[PDB]
Ligand SMILES: O=P(O)(O)O[C@@H]1[C@@H](O)[C@H](OP(=O)(O)O)[C@@H](OP(=O)(O)O)[C@H](OP(=O)(O)O)[C@H]1O
Ligand SMILES: Nc1ncnc2c1ncn2[C@@H]1O[C@H](COP(=O)(O)OP(=O)(O)O)[C@@H](O)[C@H]1O
């Protein structure tokens with residue numbers, strides 16, 4: 703029905719939502735409304751001011767649905783900008799929170815020096831996260847589910863193997879063959895759109911998600927969201943979005959992820 707049902711605020715207009723304006727994200731949504739990918743992203747209506755702050759006026763993707771189930775998939779083999787690697791080398795901001803969150807999952811993960819600092823760099827933390835999830839090997843990872851019964855979970859930090867990922871989607875679709883077939887049709891059409899998109903070939907797409915939304919009426923949709931770390935390549939250079947990331951090549955592995963995601967849902971459909 704609606705997401706509002708901490709970047710988000712309720713909109714005055716029916717079927718809209720407000721998201722805290724960020725300059726990279728605003729730039730991307732404006733380009734996307736004129737791109738092949740227009741229909742694959744939430745409608746962007748422009749910027750509005752609320753309590754002296756800038757917000758993006760977005761389509762509420764949950765509006766068409768009756769008690770929506772939602773799954774957030776973060777796309778890419780890499781989940782941080784290359785500029786974070788430079789910053790961490792020349793001017794590291796040691797993160798005590800990231801050390802604790804790492805220690806919690808694997809007490810042998812931090813180095814002797816990280817234990818001594820009780821702190822890690824952001825890129826180090828995000829690289830570790832990529833490796834214990836499916837990000838590094840499959841090019842995406844499950845971040846969170848919201849179920850129609852009001853329940854939610856973010857407990858996927860060690861969801862890594864092809865079969866572990868399949869079991870999460872299997873539980874998500876709860877044997878609804880119509881929802882799964884509609885998800886697969888939508889991902890096939892999104893892949894086709896990404897492969898021809900002028901935007902996609904000229905941008906590094908980091909930290910974006912695919913949002914899966916379905917209901918008990920068998921309505922199913924998928925959209926790309928979260929363009930806060932999507933940036934254009936300099937002087938008309940392009941990415942293939944499949945080849946491995948090597949510092950300087952700005953590759954995101956986005957389509958490696960989408961290929962693997964389509965493969966898993968196609969496998970689930972035949973179970
Ligand atoms: O707690 P964990 O392991 O999930 O880690 C979170 C990181 O601490 C956070 O960095 P930050 O702490 O510098 O904001 C990420 O923000 P950005 O990568 O967007 O800068 C966030 O990504 P998200 O906002 O969820 O897309 C990760 O999930
Ligand atoms: N346009 C939208 N309509 C409805 N729900 C949305 C929309 N965009 C995002 N969401 C919800 O908000 C969550 C966070 O979105 P995201 O854009 O990644 O924000 P953030 O950068 O603050 O993490 C999504 O996983 C989804 O549940």
Ligand SMILES: [Mn+2]
Nearest residue numbers: 909910911928
């Ligand atoms: Mn996010």
